[model samples]
Target: MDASTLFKKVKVKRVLGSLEQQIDDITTDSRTAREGSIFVASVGYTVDSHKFCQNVADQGCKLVVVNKEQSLPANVTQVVVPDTLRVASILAHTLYDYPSHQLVTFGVTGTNGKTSIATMIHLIQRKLQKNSAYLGTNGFQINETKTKGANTTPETVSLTKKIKEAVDAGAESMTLEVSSHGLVLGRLRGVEFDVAIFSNLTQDHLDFHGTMEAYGHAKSLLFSQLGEDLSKEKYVVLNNDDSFSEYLRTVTPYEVFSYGIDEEAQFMAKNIQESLQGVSFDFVTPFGTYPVKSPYVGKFNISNIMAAMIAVWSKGTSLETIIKAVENLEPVEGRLEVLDPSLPIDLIIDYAHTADGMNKLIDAVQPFVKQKLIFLVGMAGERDLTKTPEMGRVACRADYVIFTPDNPANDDPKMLTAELAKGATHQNYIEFDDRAEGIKHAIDIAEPGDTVVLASKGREPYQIMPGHIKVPHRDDLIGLEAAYKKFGGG
Candidate 1:
């Protein structure tokens, strides 16, 4: 494409190249620059790519986009702009021909339930015969294809490329789990959401967001950008039970489609029943009511399912189709997953990393616990330190708690595990820096009717530490299976 056509919508301060120059692609990484590529120089947290401006210019790059005129070779053309990070997203979207516009999109944002909600929406659409893809913490999937993703919401260039891939693969729609960091850092810049769903916001991610208010505001950016064009009817699906939902309602200009179990809402659930088998509820809406059944356990799932129900329902899918599809919806991996129910004891694995989420899981399991309950809890290092001890306090609510290291990222395993154990109020609390050892100990002590839960890093495949690279052959589910087979003592 010609530079003139691409720069038509960009804010350009000056240009040193001919507007007719053909550029093949745009990138912020100098390593990806090619002869027809336009390299963008932006300042990042630890390192500034502007220092590599001269290097990219010498790599056969025809044009260079920068925040200001930098040390570029005389042979290379420079496009000066006030900001390169923001412009890169715009340019990539245009370069991809606005792939998001070609498909119906839904954005699900919150601290915990974002993954389950987005996955449920994708499952519902796919069951209804509308080919759909999902981008979130679990992974990226389009129909039969799946890619293990490192980020919940990828960078703009990669995000746009994936959307283009899904659309080209005959997908009619997609659901994205938009993280607060993604929205705040401009990752979702060129993406326009038709329907945005808000699950409850809690005290996770404060290490990056600094405060709950800032976190709320970061998520609010999604609704605020629900474009004002009246030709399209944009809807905001909100959890009326959350206090922040009231504030989110005022941020968006579109009519809010609310769902909840506690308060009166346009979408509400009645006769909600949760058990070891699964959850069954009557999904009520302003128009009608439908009985909902899910193989997932827990009361919080009521909110998650409602979020998915209203999101797809708002997209013109019939309520009957939604209800029928949900009955067949399988449990999302790592979120309240029960393993080998046929086993004598009840064993569970969950990805609850926050204090609120742990408490909710505990509440859900208390009714089903016949005897002693042993919990294996963990907290990642280099994250919000405040949440560490809080997780311990909540874990102590069980009959026994085991403090293990969960991705001690850049922090010493012993040091952070000690910090986490400080909040345990129970005398039966134990600490094991090794997660597998912790699980083995829990299994050895369990009785036939007892319950055991391995918390944090459920179905996660690696143990990441400070200096060493991530070691594979690790996951809570793997550890639990091994322990049960070896130590069942039946």
Candidate 2:
């Protein structure tokens, strides 16, 4: 691609060097800049890439896009735009030949259930012999190939590249977990979405957005961006039970489909039965009612399953095929995942990090707690501090609670734990400086019929600590080892 073609639609205040110069790639990070690459120097919250303009120019970068002026070699082309980030998104989409427009795209936004809903839709599509791709917190999966993800939703350049990869891999559809930060930061600026899903909104990310209204407004971006082209078909999937859904429904002019357990909706689950083994419900949809049984445990998952089924069904799949796919659906990794069921005590792990998530998780597992509910939870430092106490309060629902460290990045773990302890309404909880020791204590004290829940971090392979470090930490592995040590025959 030539620099002229890439910046054809981009608003340019000034340009130096030749626009006809051919470009091989585009990047925002200076570290990845190379020969024939165009580096977009955007001002970030922490570090400004404009400072590295000369460095990238020295590294043989063909062009530099910037909002700030810089002195570079005459050989390097410089294009000045009002907002480098916005330009980067446009250029990335153009470079990828608009992959999202070619694929059936689903964008899911909410405080929770984003990963489960997106992953299930991708899995169901693949199960029906239709090639599909998924990008979310768990990772990126295109058919059998998988890779780790740096963010729930990556930056526009990386995101466009992945969507192009999916298109090239013969994928018929793609699902993305759109985060509030991702939307506000313009990471998904130019991607076209065929369906926008609102799972549910609750108190979370207040540290970044500063208020619930601002956070909800950020989520509304996905729906609003669906655009007003009635000629093209588009849909909005909302959980009717969430009050935020009412506001979300008003934001878009597209056709809306609602799903929930408590509220009347196009897709609703009735006679829901949940247990440690699994959950079964009568899925009443606009098409017809069907008996739905899944290996996934918990009442919360019933909503996620319904959301996924509706999104896929709206794409022209039959209700029977979607129901058949649900029967063989595997438990999403790290979400209500059971570990070592052969052991006497039932051990589970989940990614429930917010007050609402914790409350629902406890509600889901309470029915099968024959003896005691031992819960291990932690407050992630440098996050929404206002929710820590509420999280502690919710964890108190357990018979025994272990408060431990969860990614105390640059913030003192002791302070976080103290703040979390402020919400405990009872004396049934204990604090632990070391998460490993907390897991050991929880497993050691659990009896044959007890249930031990390791909440928050899920299957994350590393723990973020002070000084921007990531130390190897797997909660599932540590919990299983402790459980085997306590209950496994040696």
| Tens-place lDDT digits, model 2, residues 93-144 | 8887889999999999999999989988988888898999999898899986
In candidate 1, position 332 carries an lDDT of 80
lDDT tens digits, residue span 91-126, model 1: 888888898898999999998888889989998888
| Candidate 2 minimal-lDDT segment of 10 residues | 4-13
Pairs with steric clashes in candidate 1: none
- Number of the top candidate by TM-score? 2
- The whole-model lDDT of each prediction reads 0.84, 0.89
* lDDT accuracy of residue 45 in candidate 2: 72
What is the model-wide C-alpha lDDT for candidate 2? 0.89
Error of 1 at 388 (Å): 2.5
Best by lDDT: 2
